Structure 1
């Protein structure tokens, strides 16, 4: 009945005969009239009512209300909760603003954020995130904001973080217009967020979520060992970091990548593997040390003759 009501919702909806059928189904018809040899219909009726209630929400909203066959205490609180006649420019004013002054992730709005994320696009999502982040202009609140953001950014860590980085870091280093933003300590907080999500993603991760398993079918080449999307994005960002380390103009971004390299220091880390076949990481670490022992030691993977070069260079 529910499946065919949904199918008729997929129709012109001008007859609404299935609506009357569902209404009859939710009515008091089977009130132990016939010889129901169940002896447990009481609980069975409760299960049937709650099952009818959980689905067909589009019918339960777009049509007349049911005759309340649940007779419970409180229905599912988690729902759309999105004001229809209002734009999307409220996620920061209703959630991000409050949670900044708050001390937790506001579990209630977690579902709302999940719906917003699996509804819109990660690009503008992270764009508005970093936009709202670039508003405190004070170290403590920026730190609190980025800490809580890393947490609320979970349940989609790997792919969302990869796309976020590969879009915002080039989208900021590419021109000088966006250099205006990264000049603030919010830039350092963002760098910390970046290295944190990168190190978490590179490590083993299961990432089994409701709105992630059913929405894990995409395609991306990134236009940038092995051929892995995460590894490709890591190499791309490393190459862009080395490029940004270039000369002829440097106000904010050398300090930004300095903060990046500093926060990159971490035990049990394996990023910047730097394959020794035809890869840039060698000259990249050379120029980075040519800007103290963090990168000098990271490049020293296995004391290979390749690493001996950067060792001699860092010896100075």
Structure 2
């Protein structure tokens, strides 16, 4: 469903139409927010970033809408949501571990978001970036938003700090994102953002 949707999406070739498209699409994704957003964050983003065949699509200005789409659905999912419908509660019993290798809880949405962010940081690596550098740029840009609470950024041995350090080479945007709770961990990224 979402695959064919995003496939039909990249045809406008004009920012306004793509904007209206993603605007209507965020709404059409309602009534199934949890599972739809899970499947999206799990497949549709790696489905283009992991390989080069689908990289061709990511170069489009629709890519900015796709980034906006991703951050919007992530924010909506992380936010409080009951979503209890008859045709949904009667069909909300499956099994999935997501095989999310770890090399503040155990929740499918949170784990999928962590895996997604890890893959973002990995794609942010060097030695190849034609289309996806702009993708992660737009992602980080649209992620910046007031009244938001996503991008928790665990601070044990994780990428987000090095990720922000690298994104600084593409000024104070990440200087605000990484500042989770003014913890001593944030002192490092603050010093790096001092420049």
TM category, shorter: over 0.9
How far has the Cα of 1:236 moved from its partner?
A: 0.6
**TM-score calculated relative to the size of structure 2:** 0.93
How far has the Cα of 1:278 moved from its partner?
A: 3.4
Counterparts of 1:209 and 1:182, CA distance in 2: 35
**TM-score calculated relative to the size of structure 1:** 0.58
How far has the Cα of 1:230 moved from its partner?
A: 0.8
How far has the Cα of 1:168 moved from its partner?
A: 1.0
Query: Does 293-302 or 272-281 show the bigger shift?
Result: 272-281
Cα RMSD after superposing both structures: 1.3
User: Does the CA contact (< 8 Å) of 1:155 and 1:208 recur in 2?
Assistant: no
Candidates 264, 273, 276, aligned match of 2:152:
273
Counterparts of 1:190 and 1:271, CA distance in 2: 17
User: Whose radius of gyration is greater, 1 or 2?
Assistant: 1
CA separation of 1:219 and 1:290: change in aligned 2, threshold 3 A:
farther
How far has the Cα of 1:173 moved from its partner?
A: 0.6
Equivalenced residues, count: 192
CA separation of 1:248 and 1:152: change in aligned 2, threshold 3 A:
same
User: Does the CA contact (< 8 Å) of 1:157 and 1:201 recur in 2?
Assistant: yes
* Larger RCO, structure (CA 8 Å, separation 6 or more): 2
Counterparts of 2:83 and 2:165, CA distance in 1: 36
1:166 is aligned to 42
Q: Which runs of 4+ in 1 moved over 6 A?
A: none
How far has the Cα of 1:300 moved from its partner?
A: 1.0
CA separation of 1:223 and 1:288: change in aligned 2, threshold 3 A:
farther
CA separation of 1:154 and 1:246: change in aligned 2, threshold 3 A:
same
Candidates 3, 14, 31, aligned match of 1:138:
14
Query: Does 236-245 or 296-305 show the bigger shift?
Result: 296-305
User: Does the CA contact (< 8 Å) of 1:150 and 1:197 recur in 2?
Assistant: yes
User: Does the CA contact (< 8 Å) of 2:71 and 2:143 recur in 1?
Assistant: yes
How far has the Cα of 1:250 moved from its partner?
A: 1.1
Counterparts of 1:226 and 1:281, CA distance in 2: 18
User: Does the CA contact (< 8 Å) of 2:41 and 2:113 recur in 1?
Assistant: no
User: Does the CA contact (< 8 Å) of 1:162 and 1:233 recur in 2?
Assistant: yes
1:286 is aligned to 165
Counterparts of 1:289 and 1:217, CA distance in 2: 43
User: Does the CA contact (< 8 Å) of 2:37 and 2:74 recur in 1?
Assistant: yes
